[PDB]
Coordinates of C-alpha atoms and ligand atoms in Angstrom, one line a residue:
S1 CA -7.6 -5.0 -13.8
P2 CA -5.4 -3.8 -11.3
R3 CA -9.2 -3.3 -9.3
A4 CA -8.8 -7.0 -8.5
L5 CA -5.9 -5.9 -6.1
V6 CA -8.1 -4.5 -3.2
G7 CA -8.0 -6.3 -0.8
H8 CA -4.9 -8.3 -0.9
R9 CA -2.2 -7.4 1.9
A10 CA 0.9 -5.9 0.9
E11 CA 4.2 -5.4 2.5
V12 CA 6.0 -2.6 2.7
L13 CA 9.7 -1.9 1.2
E14 CA 9.7 1.9 1.7
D15 CA 8.0 3.7 4.2
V16 CA 4.8 4.5 3.1
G17 CA 3.5 8.2 4.0
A18 CA 1.4 11.2 1.8
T19 CA 3.2 11.1 -1.2
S20 CA 5.7 7.8 -1.7
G21 CA 5.8 4.7 -0.5
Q22 CA 6.8 1.0 -2.1
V23 CA 5.1 -2.4 -1.5
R24 CA 5.6 -6.2 -2.6
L25 CA 2.1 -6.9 -3.7
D26 CA 1.5 -10.3 -5.9
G27 CA 5.0 -10.8 -6.4
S28 CA 5.9 -7.6 -7.7
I29 CA 6.9 -3.7 -6.4
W30 CA 4.0 -1.6 -6.5
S31 CA 4.4 2.2 -5.8
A32 CA 1.9 3.2 -2.7
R33 CA 0.3 6.3 -0.9
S34 CA -1.3 6.2 2.8
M35 CA -5.0 6.1 2.8
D36 CA -4.7 9.2 5.2
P37 CA -1.4 11.1 4.4
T38 CA -0.3 11.6 8.2
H39 CA -0.4 8.4 8.8
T40 CA 3.1 6.6 7.9
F41 CA 3.6 2.9 7.0
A42 CA 7.2 2.1 8.2
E43 CA 9.2 -0.8 6.2
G44 CA 8.5 -3.9 7.1
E45 CA 4.9 -3.0 8.2
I46 CA 1.9 -5.4 6.4
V47 CA -0.9 -3.0 5.0
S48 CA -4.2 -4.2 3.5
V49 CA -4.7 -2.4 -0.4
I50 CA -8.2 -1.0 -0.1
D51 CA -7.9 1.3 -3.5
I52 CA -5.7 1.4 -6.8
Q53 CA -5.6 4.9 -8.1
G54 CA -3.9 4.5 -11.4
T55 CA -1.1 2.3 -10.5
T56 CA -0.9 3.4 -7.0
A57 CA -1.5 0.7 -4.2
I58 CA -3.8 3.3 -1.6
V59 CA -3.0 1.1 1.6
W60 CA -3.8 1.2 5.4
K61 CA -3.9 -1.2 8.2
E62 CA -4.3 -4.6 7.6
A63 CA -7.3 -6.2 8.0
Ligands
CL101 CL1 -3.8 -11.2 1.0
ZN102 ZN1 -3.7 -11.3 -6.3
ZN103 ZN1 -2.6 6.9 12.5
ZN104 ZN1 -10.7 5.9 -5.4

């Protein structure tokens, strides 16, 4: 069911990069990683959830 989260936007709470990050998604805090591990999304940025792996949101640029 975490699969229904794909396509949602999320707000970065702790900087999201290769191997750490946290976002606010449907009112909850989720772990997150960047889709491209060279790209960091800083706190306050809005990202798009493009995949979920277990309970980790994989995020990219909004849209
Ligand atoms: Cl959304
Ligand atoms: Zn939702
Ligand atoms: Zn980049
Ligand atoms: Zn996948």
